[PDB]
Amino acid sequence: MFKKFDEKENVSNCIQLKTSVIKGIKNQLIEQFPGIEPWLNQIMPKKDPVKIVRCHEHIEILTVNGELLFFRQREGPFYPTLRLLHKYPFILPHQQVDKGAIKFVLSGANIMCPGLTSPGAKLYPAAVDTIVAIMAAGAAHALCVGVMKMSAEDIEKVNKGIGIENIHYLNDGLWHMKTYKAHHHHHH
Amino acid sequence: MFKKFDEKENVSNCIQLKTSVIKGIKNQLIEQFPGIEPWLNQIMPKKDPVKIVRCHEHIEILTVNGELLFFRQREGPFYPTLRLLHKYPFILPHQQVDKGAIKFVLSGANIMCPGLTSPGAKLYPAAVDTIVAIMAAGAAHALCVGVMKMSAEDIEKVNKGIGIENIHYLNDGLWHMKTYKAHHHHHH
Amino acid sequence: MFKKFDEKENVSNCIQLKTSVIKGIKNQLIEQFPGIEPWLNQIMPKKDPVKIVRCHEHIEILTVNGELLFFRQREGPFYPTLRLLHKYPFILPHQQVDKGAIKFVLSGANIMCPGLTSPGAKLYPAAVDTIVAIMAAGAAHALCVGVMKMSAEDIEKVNKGIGIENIHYLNDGLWHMKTYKAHHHHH
Amino acid sequence: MFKKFDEKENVSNCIQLKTSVIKGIKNQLIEQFPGIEPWLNQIMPKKDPVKIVRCHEHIEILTVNGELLFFRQREGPFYPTLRLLHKYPFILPHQQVDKGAIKFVLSGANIMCPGLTSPGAKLYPAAVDTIVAIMAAGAAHALCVGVMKMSAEDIEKVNKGIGIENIHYLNDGLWHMKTY
Amino acid sequence: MFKKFDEKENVSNCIQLKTSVIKGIKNQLIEQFPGIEPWLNQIMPKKDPVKIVRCHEHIEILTVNGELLFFRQREGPFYPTLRLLHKYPFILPHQQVDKGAIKFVLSGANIMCPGLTSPGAKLYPAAVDTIVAIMAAGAAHALCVGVMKMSAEDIEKVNKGIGIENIHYLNDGLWHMKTY
Amino acid sequence: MFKKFDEKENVSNCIQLKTSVIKGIKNQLIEQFPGIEPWLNQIMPKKDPVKIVRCHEHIEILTVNGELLFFRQREGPFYPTLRLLHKYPFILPHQQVDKGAIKFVLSGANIMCPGLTSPGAKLYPAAVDTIVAIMAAGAAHALCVGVMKMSAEDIEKVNKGIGIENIHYLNDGLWHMKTYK
Amino acid sequence: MFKKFDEKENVSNCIQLKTSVIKGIKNQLIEQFPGIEPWLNQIMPKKDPVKIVRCHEHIEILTVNGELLFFRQREGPFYPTLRLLHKYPFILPHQQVDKGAIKFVLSGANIMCPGLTSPGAKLYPAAVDTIVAIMAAGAAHALCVGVMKMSAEDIEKVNKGIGIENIHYLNDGLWHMKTY
Amino acid sequence: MFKKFDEKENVSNCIQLKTSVIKGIKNQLIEQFPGIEPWLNQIMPKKDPVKIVRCHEHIEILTVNGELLFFRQREGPFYPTLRLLHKYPFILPHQQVDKGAIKFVLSGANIMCPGLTSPGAKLYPAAVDTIVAIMAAGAAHALCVGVMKMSAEDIEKVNKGIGIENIHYLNDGLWHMKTYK
Amino acid sequence: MFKKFDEKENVSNCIQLKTSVIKGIKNQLIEQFPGIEPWLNQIMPKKDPVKIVRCHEHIEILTVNGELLFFRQREGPFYPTLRLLHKYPFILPHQQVDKGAIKFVLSGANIMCPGLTSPGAKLYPAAVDTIVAIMAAGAAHALCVGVMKMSAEDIEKVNKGIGIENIHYLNDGLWHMKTYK
Amino acid sequence: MFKKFDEKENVSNCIQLKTSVIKGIKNQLIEQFPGIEPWLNQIMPKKDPVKIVRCHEHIEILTVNGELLFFRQREGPFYPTLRLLHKYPFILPHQQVDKGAIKFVLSGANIMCPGLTSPGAKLYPAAVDTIVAIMAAGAAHALCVGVMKMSAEDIEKVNKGIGIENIHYLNDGLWHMKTYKAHHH
Amino acid sequence: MFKKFDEKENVSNCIQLKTSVIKGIKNQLIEQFPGIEPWLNQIMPKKDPVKIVRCHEHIEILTVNGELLFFRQREGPFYPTLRLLHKYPFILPHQQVDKGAIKFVLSGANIMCPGLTSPGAKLYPAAVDTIVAIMAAGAAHALCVGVMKMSAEDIEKVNKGIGIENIHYLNDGLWHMKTYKAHHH
C-alpha cells in the first residue's frame, strides 16, 4: 500500500476527530484487534487529540501525538503500523515466512503459499481476512503487516496462489514517514 | 484484577470466620481444587484464625496467619494466590501461552485465542470458567492465574477473542501486598 | 493409605491362614496380576506360613516369612507393596507423571489429570480401578502404587480432577515398616 | 522441451509485438502466475519493445531487452524460463527431488514418483497441470521447470509413474541461448 | 516350556523318520514359516537322517546332524529353537520388549502388555497364536520365542494382561542341551 | 531366479530379433517403465542388433551390444538387470529392508514382511506385483530386484508372510554373467 | 536498586542540563553502549531539554520529554531503563537465565551461578562490570538489567557465588514510575 | 545424618539464643550462602525469637517461628533443611544424579561417581566440601542435601568411589519432624 | 568362572566363619565397595551365621541365611553375585556393551575392545582390574559382572584384544544355584 | 576446461595407440587412481582399440569403443570424465560445496573458500593440486572434477580466494559430446 | 583373494593334519583372535579330523566336518571365512565404509581412504596389518574381511590411497564354495 508513498508529496489534509467518532473507532479497533483492548488507553489517551491524515489513493492514517498508529484505504479495515506493532507485538496473530521469501516481502511482494508451507516457515492457524504480522525466523520484529487471502488450512492444502497480501513493510514509505508533520500539506 | 491494587489504599475491612463457616469454605475449596485436600489442614490449621479481608471492587481475600491464600469477587468462586499456587502447583490445570508473551502477561494482559493456538503455545482441555495456571516455556513458575472465557474447544474453533482472563499476575498489587496487615484499614 | 501409619501403633492382630483360604487368595492374585503366577511359589512357598497382619483403618497386609507382599483395605482388591513391585515390576502397568509432581507423590498426593497430560508425562491405557505403578522420568523405580479413578482416555479428554489415587509411596509408613514382627501387637 | 534445441539452428523468426498483443499476454501471465503481477513493469516495461522468438516444433519464447522471459508450445500455457525464475522464485510452487534424481533432472528426465517420496525429497500439494519449480536440497536455485502429471496426493499414495514432466532444465538449449 | 528341562533326565526315546513323514514335516514347516523354504536343503540335507527326540511332557524335538531345529508339544505347531532362529532370524515376526522386562524374559516370564507399550518397546502387528521372536533394544539376537496371546492391536489398546507367552528362552534347558 | 544360473551351462540359444518384434518390446518397456523412454535410443540404438538369449527354466534375457538389459520367465513381465538399474535407478520404485535382512537378500532369500516394518526399514506404497528395487541403508546401489507379493499396505497391516519375492540379486549368476558374447 | 522505590516518596528534585554536559554524557553513553550511537539523536533530540531527576539514595534518572532513559547511583555508570532497552534490545549484551530462576529475578534477587550454568540457561562472554540484559528463553523482552559480578567464564568454571547483580527488573518501582 | 532420627526420641533440649550469638550465626550463614542475604529478614525476622534444638549425636537445628532452617553437627558448617531449600533453591549449587540412583538417595545412600557420569546425570563444577543440592531429571525439587567428597572434575575423570555424601534427604527423620513446637 | 558350574557336582564343603574372620571380611568389602557400607548389616546381620561354600577350581562363595552374596577364586578379591548386584547396583561402576555382544555375554564370552568402542556402546573411565557391571542398552539389569583387563582409556585408544573379562553372567551355574541350603 | 568446447569445432585428430603404449597408460592410471586397477580390463579391454582424440587448447581425450574415459592438457596428468567418475566414484577423494554454489559450479565457476567453510559444506584432507570430486549435499553424483588450489587445511584457515579450480562439470561441452564416433564400434 | 576362485578348478589337494600340528594351529588362532578361545572346541572338536585344502596361488583352507573355517596364503596369518565371522563376529575389530563403496566391496575392490572418512563411514583405531571386518551401515553382517594397509589414524589424516585391502567378500568364490566334500561326513 506504501511502496511509492512519499510523505513530502502524498499527504492531502488532516482532520481532528470529535469524541463520538473516536469512541466509534475504538469500538471498531477492539472488534478487529481483541489483543489491543488492554493497551488502547495508553495508545490513545482520552485527553490527547486524535487526528486522521488523508493521503493519496484514498489512504487515511490515524495519528495521536504525531505518532502513526493505524491506517486504512477506501474506508476498509484498519491496520496497525509496524512501529506500533513492534511495541505491542501481540495485537495481531503471527505468520512466519520461509527464509527464501524475506527479500521479496521487503520489496512489497505478496506472500505466496509456497513461502508458508516450506520447512523454514511456520504457518499459524488463521481464518481468511485475518490481519497478520509477518515474521522471519529468529527475529522478534515483524517485517510486514499482511492480510490472509486464503485460510491457513487452504494455504497448506492448496499450496497455490496468493496466501497473504502484503500491505505495509519495513522501510516502505509509511515506515520512513514515521510521524505526522503538519508542514507537508496545506490547511486551507 | 489487581493491576492498580495498592494495599495502603484499597483494603476496607476484615472479618474473622466462625468454625462452622470455615468448615463449609474448606469443603468447597476441596470441591474446586481436589488436589488441595491433604494440605488444607497445613494451609489452614484448625486452631488458627481464618479471616476474610474485604477490599475495593468487591474483592475478598482469604487469609490465615497473615498469608494470602485465596481471593474472590462478589462471593464468587475462590482463586488461589500465585504465592500459594507456586507452593502447590498441582491444584490447577495449566495452559501454555505463546512463549514470547511473558512481558504482556506480566502487565495484566488477557490471553487471546491466537496466543494459545500458535505453535509456540500448548492448549489443553478446559471448560468455560475453569481456573488455570498460565505458564510460558521460559519460566518454571506460573506467571498468572487465569479463568477460561471460552472452552479450549471453542478457542481452537473460533480462534479469536479473549480465551483466558488474566486475573492475577506475578508482582501485581496482590503479589506485592504479600501479607495482611491490620494497620492499613479502620476497624470501626 | 499409610502416610501416618506407624507399625508400633497401628498393628492390631495377626491371623495365619488355612489351606483353603490361601488357595482362594492365590487365585485372586493370579486373576488380578497374571504376571505373578510363576513367581508365587517363590514369594509364597507352599510349605511356609501365610499370615494377614490386621491394621488400623481396615487395612490388612499379606505376609510370608516376614516379607510384606500385598495389602488391601475393607477386603477390597490386593495391591502390591512397593518393595515387591520393585523386585517384580511386571506385576502392574505404569503411568509416568511430570517433573514437579515427584516431591508431591512422595508426600502422598494424588495424581491430578494435568499431571498426566503434559509433555513430560506419559499416559497409557488403563481402566478405572486398574492398579498402576507411578513413575517419574527422573527415577528408575516406581515411586508409588496408584489406582485409576478415571480411565486414561477420560483423563486426556477432561484434564481436570483426580486421575489416579496414590495409595502407597516410597518411604511412607508401610515402606518404613519393611518386615513384619509379631511383637508389635497382642494376640 | 529444449534438450536438442540450438539457437543457431531452431530459431526461425522473431516478431516485435504490438501494444494490444503485449497487453493480452501480460493478462494471461497474471492469471497463471499471480505472484508476477507487481513485477511485470520491471521485466516488461512500457518504454521497451516486447518480442516473440518463433522456434521449431511450434515453440515461442517471450523476450524483452534481450532477456528470455516465458515460453510456450502449440499456443499452450506459458512457462517461465529458469533465468527468470531464479530472479523471482516465488512465481511457482516448488517440489524437491531426492539427491539420486538430480543428475537425471539435469539430463531432461521426467521426475518419477519415487524421486519425490523418499526422505531426501519434499513433496507439496499440487494439482495436475500445475507448473512447478524443481529444487534440490543442496542447490539454492531451481534446476528445472516441470508440470504435474499426477497430483502430489497421487504421487504420494501411488508411488509409481511419471509424477512431473521435465519441460526445461539448467544447461539445456534454452538455458544456453541465454539472451536473444 | 523348558525352564526345568534337563537333557540327562527328560529325554525318553528317539525316532528316525521315514521319507514320506519327513516330506510331510517339511511341507508343514513351509506352510508355517514360508521364509524357511529355500533353506530346508541346508538345515535338513536330503542325504542325512532326520530324527524326533521324544521328551517328557509330550515334547518332541526335530533334529538333523545333532542340531536341534524345531520343537512341539502334543502334536501342536512347531516352534524354532533359538539357535536356529539366530542363524535365520527371518523365520518369525519380531516384537521388542522394554528394558525392565528382559531379566524376567530370561527367567521364563511371559511378556505383559505394559512391557510392549512403553517407549523402549516396539510393537508390530501380530495375530493371536502367531509365533514371534522376542527382542531387546541393543541385543541383536532373539532372547525368547513367544506366542501371541492377545493381538498387537489389543496389547496397545487394552495395555493389561499377558500379551505373549514365553515358550523358549536363552539359557533355558533346551538352549543348554545345545545338540542331540 | 538366477541363484544356480551358470552361463556356461544354462544358456541354450540366442535369437536376433526382427524390427516389428523389437518395436513391440520397446513399447512394452515404455509401458512398464515410463522412466526409460528417453533412454531407449542409447540402450537400444536403432543401428545395433537386438537379441534374446534363451536360457533354461523358460528364461529370456534381452541384450544389445553384449549388455544384458532386461529379463523375463515364462513370457512374464520384463525385469531390469541390476547393472542396467544401477545406471538408471529411476526405472523402479524402491523399498528399503532392515539391516538384518541384507545378508539373506544377497543369498536370493525373499523379503519377509517383518524385514520391511522395523525402524531401519523404509516401506513405500506399492501395489501387488509392482517390480521394485531393494535397497540397504548405507548402500547407494540396489542390491536386488524384486516383485511385491503383498501390497505395501498389507505388509504394514499384516506383518506376516512373504512381502517381496527376490528375483535377481547382486552376485547371482546373471550378475556374474555380466555380458553376452 | 528500585525494589522499594516509590516516585511519590523518593523523588527530591529535577535539574535541566547544559549543552557541554549533554555532549559529554552522550560520549559517555556511546563509550558504555556502542550500539546506541545511531539512535541517540532519536532518543535525545538536540532540540529537546535533557533533565536529571534527583532521587533518594543518590539515584539520578536521565529524562527527555518525560521518558525515563538511563539511571545511575553516586555518579556511577549509567544503566538503561528496561522500557528503553525493550525498544533497543541490542544495546546490552544478553545473559539467559534458566527457567527455574526467573521467579527470583522478578523479585530483585541477584543471580547465582547455577541459574546460569544449568540446561535452560545461555551464558554469553562478558567481563566483570559488564552491564547486561537478563532474558528468559523464548521471550524477546529483557526481564532485568544486571551487572556482571563475576565474569561469564568464572560463572561457568567456578559455579559458586553471586554471578550477576540485579539492578532493575520488570515491575520494580522504576518500571511502575514509567514517566516523569 | 537423620535416617534414624525421631523427634520424639532424639531431641534433648531447646535454647533461646542471645543477640550476639544470633548476629554471629547470621554472619556465618551469609558467609556460607551469600544468596540467602536478602532473604534472612524474612526467614529470621529480627523481631522474632531464634532458638536452637539440641539433638543426639551433637546435632543442632536452628529454628524461627517453628520452622526448621539450618542444621549442623558438632560445631561444624550449617546445612539448609530441604524444606528451606525448596523455597530458596538458589542458595546451593546443584548436581543431577541419574535415574538409577534416586531410590537409593531416598534411602540415605551416598552418591557414587557412576551415578553422576551416566547420560541421565548432570555434573557441574564443585570443589571438595561444597554443600550441594541433589536433583533428579524428572523431578523438579531437591531430593537430598549433600557434600562433595571428590571434586566434580575428579568424579568425571575417576568414575569410582563416593562422589557426594548424602547428609539429609526427602522423608528422613528431619523432613518428618517438619516443625519444632 | 561358572559356565560349567553345577551345585550338585562342584560343591565340596561348607564352613562357618568365626567372629574376627567375619569382621575382616566386612572391612575388606567396605574398602572394595564403599557404597555397600550402610547395607552390610542387612545383607550380613551380626546375629546370623556367615558361611563359605567351598567349590571346585578354588572357588569360594560367601553365604548368609542361604543367600549367595559374594564369590572369589584362589583367595582373590570378592565379587558380588549378580542377584546381589541387582538389589544394590550402585556398588559397581558400569560399562555398556553394544548389541552384537549380548548373546555372547550370556554365553560367558569376554568383552573385546571393539564391542565397547562402537556407537551403541558406552565406555566410562575405569582402571585396569576394576570390577564392573556389564549392561546392554535394552536391559535394566546387569547381564554380567566383569573385570577390566585394559583401562577404558586403552580400550578406546587401542581397540583390540580383551577389554573386560566376563566372570559371572545371568543364568550361569552360580545364578542357577541361587541359594545354599 | 570445457565450458565453450564444441565437438563439431574443437576436435582436430584421432589416433589409435599401439599396444606397448597402452601398458604405460594403464600404469599411469594405476599410479594416479589406485582404486581403478582391478577395473582397467573392463574400462579398456585388451581386444578393443584405444584412441586419443586430439582437441584444441592442447587437450587430449582417451577413448575406447566411443566412450570418453580421461582427459589431459599438454600431456599432463589425466583427469576422469564425469561420466566415468559416476561409474567409479572411488577413484577420487571428494569435497562438498554448499547449496549456493551448485548453479555456479554448473556454470564452470571455481569454488571459493567461503563455499567450503559454510555449514552446508564439508571439507576433507587434500593437498594442493589434488584432483577431487565436487559434491553437493542435494545430489548423489559429482557435479564437477576439481583441482585443489589451496590445501583443505588452508581453505578452512584462510577462508579467502579460490580454493578449488573447476575443470570439468556436468553438462559442459565434454559431457555434452558424450561419445566419439560410436558408429565406428 | 577369491574373486576368480572356482572350487572345481582351483583346488589341488587335501591333507589331514596330525594332532600336535592341530594343537599348534589352535594356539596360533587363540593368539591372533583372543575372543575365539572358548569357542574353538565347538569349531574344531578334538575328536573330528582337521584338514587343509590346498589351492592355487599358495592358498590353504582350514576345514573340519566339511565347513570352511580359516584361510591363509603360504604360511601367512589365518583369516576367518565370512561364514565363520558371521557366527562369531567379535573375533575382529570392524570398520564401516560409506554407501558408495558397498557395490564395489562386493566386487572385491579395496577400500580407499575417502570411503572411510565421509559422513556415513565410521573409522576406529586399527594398526597396519590388523585384520578387520568391513561393515555397511544398512547391513548387520560383515560384507568383507580386510587388512589395514594404512593405520586408521593415517587414513583420517591423509585421506588418500588404499586404506584397507579387501581379501574375501560375500559371494566371492570361497563364499560360493561353502563346503568341502560335506558328503564325507
Side-chain angles (χ1 to χ4, degrees), chain D residues 86 99 102-103 137-140 171, chain J residues 86 99 102-103 106 138-140 171:
Chain D
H86 292 164
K99 65 193 190 190
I102 298 313
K103 161 178 173 140
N171 284 319
Chain J
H86 288 169
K99 60 186 318 188
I102 296 328
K103 166 188 168 145
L106 297 177
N171 226 354

Side-chain angles (χ1 to χ4, degrees), chain A residues 66-85:
Chain A
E67 296 284 84
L68 310 181
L69 305 185
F70 303 85
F71 62 90
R72 73 188 322 182
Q73 184 164 52
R74 299 178 268 284
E75 296 160 339
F78 288 100
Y79 303 93
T81 63
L82 282 166
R83 292 185 187 276
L84 179 64
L85 186 59

